[PDB]
């Protein structure tokens, strides 16, 4: 089950079998999706579109390509205010992992910190309880629901598993289909190294290229248990249970239960 233009894509029922298939879906950014990827979202009744992506990237990249009779909704994620002083810290950390040091060790070490503390920053980020909380009722709603980012496996992850966690999902599922999004890094790594083309000049600084593509196509491609297990942590000592994290983020157990009645077979 492809969706042209687009990777990462998987309904959430095809590893969580106790959920009805049709209802919840993932994929990466569909800026690029074509003709095909746009008669499948149809085919396949989507008719909710979650955006993940903060608005920066949707301006530099654009706007979900999707058919008519679609609704996107745009969910940003870090949610950034005309405030340097908002960005900063996510300029701050991406200037970091790119550069802290030529060996493969320490580039991979330098992912794994950067990916470790942005995860445990994740639910208390501005942007991703309001996104949640979006996800929630269009889904408690009976609406058919794709969520994505960029790369469909961290942001659009966090968001999934907390949904799959919220309806009474065993961790071993949820870390499944959490995972899965691993085999879609030689994709991701040919979608990146396609962008660092575009947005360098490859023949006047491609010493800049080079050292930047060795930073944005090994480790920092994949995703690991450790990582949710810390945006997991996070939600465990600030609220002390899943479902006050939820409350915090304007849902409550009822419309939970609805979800849960919609979801499961
Ligand atoms: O350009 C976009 O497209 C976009 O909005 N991005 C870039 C991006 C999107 C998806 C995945 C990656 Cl790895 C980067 C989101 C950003 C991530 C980090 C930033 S930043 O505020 O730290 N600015 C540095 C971007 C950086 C870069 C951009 C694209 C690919 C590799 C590196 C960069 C741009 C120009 C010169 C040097 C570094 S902006
Ligand atoms: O969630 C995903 O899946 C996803 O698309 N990414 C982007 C990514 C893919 C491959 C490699 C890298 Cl370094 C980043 C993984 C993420 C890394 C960090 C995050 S974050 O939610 O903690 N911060 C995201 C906003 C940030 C950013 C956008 C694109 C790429 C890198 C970082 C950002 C927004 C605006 C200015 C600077 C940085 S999400």
Redesign the pocket.
């Given at each position: 089950r492809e969706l042209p233009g687009a990777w990462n894509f998987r309904d959430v029922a095809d590893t969580a079998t106790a959920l009805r298939p049709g209802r919840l879906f993932r994929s990466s950014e569909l800026s690029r999706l074509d003709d095909a990827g746009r008669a499948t979202l149809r085919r396949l009744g989507i008719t909710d579109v979650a955006d993940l992506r903060?608005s920066?990237?949707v301006?530099?990249?654009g706007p979900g390509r999707v058919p008519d009779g679609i609704d996107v909704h745009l969910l940003p994620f870090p949610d950034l205010a005309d405030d340097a002083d908002d960005?900063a810290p996510?300029?701050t950390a991406?200037?970091r992992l790119?550069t802290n040091g030529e060996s493969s060790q320490s580039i991979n070490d330098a992912a794994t910190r950067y990916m470790t503390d942005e995860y445990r920053q994740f639910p208390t980020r501005n942007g991703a309880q309001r996104a949640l909380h979006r996800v929630v009722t269009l889904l408690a709603a009976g609406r058919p629901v794709l969520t994505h980012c960029?790369?469909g496996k961290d942001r659009t992850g966090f968001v999934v598993a907390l949904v799959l966690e919220a309806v009474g999902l065993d961790r071993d599922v949820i870390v499944a289909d959490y995972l899965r999004s691993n085999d879609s890094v030689p994709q991701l790594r040919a979608r990146?190294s396609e962008?660092?083309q575009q947005?360098?000049d490859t023949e006047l600084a491609p010493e800049?290229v080079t050292f930047?593509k060795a930073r944005?196509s090994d480790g920092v491609l994949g995703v690991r248990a450790e990582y949710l297990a810390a945006a997991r942590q996070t939600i465990d000592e600030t609220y002390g249970s899943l479902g006050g994290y939820l409350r915090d983020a304007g849902i409550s157990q009822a419309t939970v239960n609805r979800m849960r009645g919609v979801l499961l077979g």
């Open positions: 903060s920066r990237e301006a530099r990249r960005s996510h300029e991406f200037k790119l960029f790369a990146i962008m660092i947005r360098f800049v930047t944005l």
